[PDB]
Amino acid sequence: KKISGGSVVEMQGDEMTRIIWELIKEKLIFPYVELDLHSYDLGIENRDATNDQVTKDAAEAIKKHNVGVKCATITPDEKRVEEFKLKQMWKSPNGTIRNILGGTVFREAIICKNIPRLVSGWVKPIIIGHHAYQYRATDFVVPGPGKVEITYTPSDGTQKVTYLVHNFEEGGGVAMGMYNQDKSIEDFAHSSFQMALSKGWPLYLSTKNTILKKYDGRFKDIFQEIYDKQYKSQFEAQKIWYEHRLIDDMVAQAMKSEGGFIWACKNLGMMTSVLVCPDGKTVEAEAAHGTVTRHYRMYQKGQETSTNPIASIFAWTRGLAHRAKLDNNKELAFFANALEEVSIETIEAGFMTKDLAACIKGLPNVQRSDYLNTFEFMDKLGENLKIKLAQAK
Amino acid sequence: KKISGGSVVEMQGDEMTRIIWELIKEKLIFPYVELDLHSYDLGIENRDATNDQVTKDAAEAIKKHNVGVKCATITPDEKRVEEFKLKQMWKSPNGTIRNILGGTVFREAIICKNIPRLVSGWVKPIIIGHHAQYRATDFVVPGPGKVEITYTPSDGTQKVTYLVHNFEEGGGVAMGMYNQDKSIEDFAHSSFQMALSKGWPLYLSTKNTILKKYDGRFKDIFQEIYDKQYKSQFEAQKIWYEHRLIDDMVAQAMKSEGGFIWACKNSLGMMTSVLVCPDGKTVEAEAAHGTVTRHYRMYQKGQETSTNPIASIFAWTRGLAHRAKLDNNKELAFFANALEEVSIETIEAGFMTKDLAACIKGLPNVQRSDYLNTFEFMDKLGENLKIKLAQAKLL
Numbered sequence: 001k002k003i004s005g006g007s008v009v010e011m012q013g014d015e016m017t018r019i020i021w022e023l024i025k026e027k028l029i030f031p032y033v034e035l036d037l038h039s040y041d042l043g044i045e046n047r048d049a050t051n052d053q054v055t056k057d058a059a060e061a062i063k064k065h066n067v068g069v070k071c072a073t074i075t076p077d078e079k080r081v082e083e084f085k086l087k088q089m090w091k092s093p094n095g096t097i098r099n100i101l102g103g104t105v106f107r108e109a110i111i112c113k114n115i116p117r118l119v120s121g122w123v124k125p126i127i128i129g130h131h132a133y134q135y136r137a138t139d140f141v142v143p144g145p146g147k148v149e150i151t152y153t154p155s156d157g158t159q160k161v162t163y164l165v166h167n168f169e170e171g172g173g174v175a176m177g178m179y180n181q182d183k184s185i186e187d188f189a190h191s192s193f194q195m196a197l198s199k200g201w202p203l204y205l206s207t208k209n210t211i212l213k214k215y216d217g218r219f220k221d222i223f224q225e226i227y228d229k230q231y232k233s234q235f236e237a238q239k240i241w242y243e244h245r246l247i248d249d250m251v252a253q254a255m256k257s258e259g260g261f262i263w264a265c266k267n268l269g270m271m272t273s274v275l276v277c278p279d280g281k282t283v284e285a286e287a288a289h290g291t292v293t294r295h296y297r298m299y300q301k302g303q304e305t306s307t308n309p310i311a312s313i314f315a316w317t318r319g320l321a322h323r324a325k326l327d328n329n330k331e332l333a334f335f336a337n338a339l340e341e342v343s344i345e346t347i348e349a350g351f352m353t354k355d356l357a358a359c360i361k362g363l364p365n366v367q368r369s370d371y372l373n374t375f376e377f378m379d380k381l382g383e384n385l386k387i388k389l390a391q392a393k
Numbered sequence: 394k395k396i397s398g399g400s401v402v403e404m405q406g407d408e409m410t411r412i413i414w415e416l417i418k419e420k421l422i423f424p425y426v427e428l429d430l431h432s433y434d435l436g437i438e439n440r441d442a443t444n445d446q447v448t449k450d451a452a453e454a455i456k457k458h459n460v461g462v463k464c465a466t467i468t469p470d471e472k473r474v475e476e477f478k479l480k481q482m483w484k485s486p487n488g489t490i491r492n493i494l495g496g497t498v499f500r501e502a503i504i505c506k507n508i509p510r511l512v513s514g515w516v517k518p519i520i521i522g523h524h525a526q527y528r529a530t531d532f533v534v535p536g537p538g539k540v541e542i543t544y545t546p547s548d549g550t551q552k553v554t555y556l557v558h559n560f561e562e563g564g565g566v567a568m569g570m571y572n573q574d575k576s577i578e579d580f581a582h583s584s585f586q587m588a589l590s591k592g593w594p595l596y597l598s599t600k601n602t603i604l605k606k607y608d609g610r611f612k613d614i615f616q617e618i619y620d621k622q623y624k625s626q627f628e629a630q631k632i633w634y635e636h637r638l639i640d641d642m643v644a645q646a647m648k649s650e651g652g653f654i655w656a657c658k659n660s661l662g663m664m665t666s667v668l669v670c671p672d673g674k675t676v677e678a679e680a681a682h683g684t685v686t687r688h689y690r691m692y693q694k695g696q697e698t699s700t701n702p703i704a705s706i707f708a709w710t711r712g713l714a715h716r717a718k719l720d721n722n723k724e725l726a727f728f729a730n731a732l733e734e735v736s737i738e739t740i741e742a743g744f745m746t747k748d749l750a751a752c753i754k755g756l757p758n759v760q761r762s763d764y765l766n767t768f769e770f771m772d773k774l775g776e777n778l779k780i781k782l783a784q785a786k787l788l
């Protein structure tokens with residue numbers, strides 16, 4: 001028998017990533033895991049045909065079943081409108097999903113010890129998070145001389161404060177009002193603490209509390225208040241810690257570190273993007289790359305392609321590990337981790353796609369024998385996964 | 394007989410950079426170029442003794458003489474005030490100079506074929522310049538209530554009110570930001586001037602899809618200034634100006650070979666900072682790093698140092714190249730060019746400081762035999778510059 005995986009929302013996408021997404025299911029997921037699969041086709045022709053209703057239904061399904069795994073999708077522009085003869089310039093599916101779900105986006109690189117890195121000392125992955133909806137900022141044109149003031153009027157009427165933003169004396173310009181609700185800062189803190197707990201790494205928040213004393217100071221304060229009143233014991237029980245750092249000081253210390261921390265910031269086929277909702281229940285994983293149009297155009301002309309599926313595979317493993325965590329499914333938790341180990345071990349043993357071979361040898365030096373095409377790489381992952389799971393019994 | 398280099402404003406600085414700066418003058422500039430040198434000592438001690446008046450005078454001299462070359466200076470904090478027994482926590486000399494001159498700062502890395510970078514395809518440098526918010530008005534929203542931003546016209550016409558946010562439950566934070574048209578225009582002029590002098594295309598990146606009014610004014614002003622006064626000059630030089638959304642800009646740059654100016658509305662010894670004034674005549678060149686205090690302490694204790702002088706040498710070469718452009722000085726233009734090529738070529742041939750050796754071999758495997766100390770490196774540049782200039786005499 002296969003592992004009973006439970007309830008998973010799956011989102012199909014476009015171009016080359018749509019092809020490798022089906023190969024991940026066909027060769028790595030379905031031969032070992034049985035799922036109550038809620039599949040939504042977020043392909044550009046389907047989103048056009050349904051007037052983007054499929055994206056909204058897919059977003060509601062993630063809210064209901066707590067686990068979303070998404071394939072890369074085309075965000076329409078004037079060229080795509082002309083290419084597919086679209087009805088509208090459909091909004092980014094990711095934006096629509098994010099708007100309905102809410103949460104914090106965390107990006108994480110997949111580290112293969114034999115693959116070159118910007119900072120060679122980084123041996124453990126760094127996870128970088130930014131809170132999701134400057135979007136809700138009121139900007140405007142100042143047509144000429146005059147004063148721009150910002151006023152705060154409490155609900156009872158009393159303790160009203162007016163601040164001069166600028167007195168324009170020699171002409172016009174622009175001005176804007178920006179805000180941040182406490183709830184959004186608390187959600188950002190929760191998603192960050194819950195992320196650091198599920199990973200088992202220390203958490204660092206970086207602000208500019210020296211430039212924006214009051215604005216960024218409330219981020220530093222809220223994160224500390226939630227840490228002491230709700231997470232300090234859980235962090236100590238997992239030997240990790242939370243600390244705030246100034247961005248200038250944080251960048252400098254990060255270079256001298258070996259990575260392996262969650263980095264909360266106030267302001268390619270080896271990187272994931274995971275939306276972590278404040279509830280600590282709902283997660284949506286996807287590769288942090290696009291649909292790889294250039295490889296898809298080669299595929300369309302009968303040319304052999306060599307597309308890296310690691311980021312797409314890790315969207316499945318991060319989502320399945322989360323599904324296993326919610327359901328206390330030990331066999332699924334094991335599978336999700338074994339698939340990640342196999343992916344890294346295969347590249348570390350020298351079996352990789354052309355892009356990774358180019359990172360090592362340099363593109364002009366890459367020979368056909370230095371890499372595997374899309375299918376051969378998936379088959380090598382499939383053999384190693386069969387072996388790894390057969391050893392585990 | 395030395396080159397007549399003309400009028401150049403020079404600013405001396407502090408700690409390790411002050412030492413390197415004197416070696417650059419003594420071994421690479423003075424043996425071949427004679428200048429009507431306007432030197433200002435911006436050392437922490439001199440600024441303290443003169444009550445920062447030296448800084449203001451140096452800034453006025455750059456305005457008058459058009460070319461400034463500056464050594465890195467200590468910006469005081471509470472620890473420096475104790476260390477030097479300063480009368481005040483004097484403002485940053487760069488901030489004082491920028492206040493008097495105006496202009497946009499453009500950073501450009503020095504590329505060496507053997508020194509790794511983010512994208513291997515970037516063979517020509519990318520020059521990035523940001524709009525010169527620190528002057529924003531921020532405050533805490535203690536509880537429920539309305540936050541509005543208003544504009545009262547000076548001509549007595551109707552006051553305009555915008556709702557920033559209505560806090561129905563709980564509080565938060567809020568802020569106001571502004572930008573004057575004149576700064577946006579100055580940013581456009583400095584960027585167009587920078588592109589014309591370098592002979593490279595210019596890209597302005599904004600988030601005009603989100604900040605339709607705020608970033609839309611940057612895009613509109615850059616387009617208006619371009620079409621009405623630079624398009625001809627740009628086409629004549631086979632270059633172009635284009636606005637790009639920050640997302641498309643990051644994508645286009647990754648798949649590029651470098652060689653463009655990037656104005657954006659938002660290893661250290663291998664980057665320069667040039668304050669480019671909107672007039673197209675005034676320029677102030679310096680290294681993007683600081684006074685290298687850690688290295689200075691080692692040098693102070695008689696311990697060997699390996700400090701990268703490239704960024705400081707390029708502050709001089711960019712200023713000399715600007716000077717030659719202003720005076721049509723072909724000999725000074727060739728000299729600045731040759732000093733840049735010697736520096737790059739010396740590194741490329743395996744002669745470099747520890748920081749560069751760490752970029753190729755990785756800090757854990759860098760041996761003493763892989764690099765030259767500060768003095769040994771400067772000597773190697775002096776020796777190669779003499780050879781390059783003698784070989785150039787064959788023209």
Ligand SMILES: NC(=O)c1ccc[n+]([C@@H]2O[C@H](COP(=O)([O-])OP(=O)(O)OC[C@H]3O[C@@H](n4cnc5c(N)ncnc54)[C@H](OP(=O)(O)O)[C@@H]3O)[C@@H](O)[C@H]2O)c1
Nearest residue numbers: 072073074075268269287289290291292293294307308355
């Ligand atoms: N996750 C998402 O839903 C998402 C995010 C961004 C963009 N998009 C959409 O994607 C469409 C096309 O975007 P794009 O092709 O310019 O971006 P991209 O897919 O990220 O591809 C840019 C280049 O990066 C390399 N690359 C990226 N992913 C790779 C992988 N898995 N394996 C190997 N190489 C990989 C390829 O380099 P070479 O060309 O050298 O082979 C590729 O041509 C757009 O319409 C955009 O809206 C979707």
Ligand SMILES: NC(=O)c1ccc[n+]([C@@H]2O[C@H](COP(=O)([O-])OP(=O)(O)OC[C@H]3O[C@@H](n4cnc5c(N)ncnc54)[C@H](OP(=O)(O)O)[C@@H]3O)[C@@H](O)[C@H]2O)c1
Nearest residue numbers: 465466467468661662682683684685686687700701702748
């Ligand atoms: N342009 C300016 O006038 C300016 C700008 C910033 C700061 N400063 C002033 O500089 C002083 C010291 O600041 P800081 O130590 O934080 O900054 P920094 O001087 O830029 O030095 C930081 C570190 O960067 C490396 N580094 C920088 N320049 C280098 C070079 N030319 N060659 C080799 N390594 C180099 C060294 O790393 P390792 O430790 O690995 O050797 C150095 O310790 C302060 O008093 C500050 O106010 C001046």
Ligand SMILES: Cc1ccc2c(c1C)N(C(=O)Nc1ccc(C(C)(C)C)cc1)Cc1cccnc1N2
Nearest residue numbers: 107108109117118122124125126127128251254259
């Ligand atoms: C968005 C993102 C998220 C997570 C990661 C990355 C990126 C790109 N990576 C990276 O180099 N981030 C990075 C962080 C800071 C800098 C500074 C210090 C120059 C500001 C530069 C790059 C890839 C990388 C590799 C190994 C281990 N961790 C990572 N994590």
Ligand SMILES: Cc1ccc2c(c1C)N(C(=O)Nc1ccc(C(C)(C)C)cc1)Cc1cccnc1N2
Nearest residue numbers: 500501502510511515517518519520521643646651
């Ligand atoms: C401040 C600065 C100015 C100029 C330069 C740089 C830096 C750091 N450099 C660089 O990597 N900038 C950079 C630009 C964009 C990105 C994105 C696309 C990832 C956002 C990342 C880095 C060094 C570099 C090397 C080769 C040629 N040009 C440059 N120019």
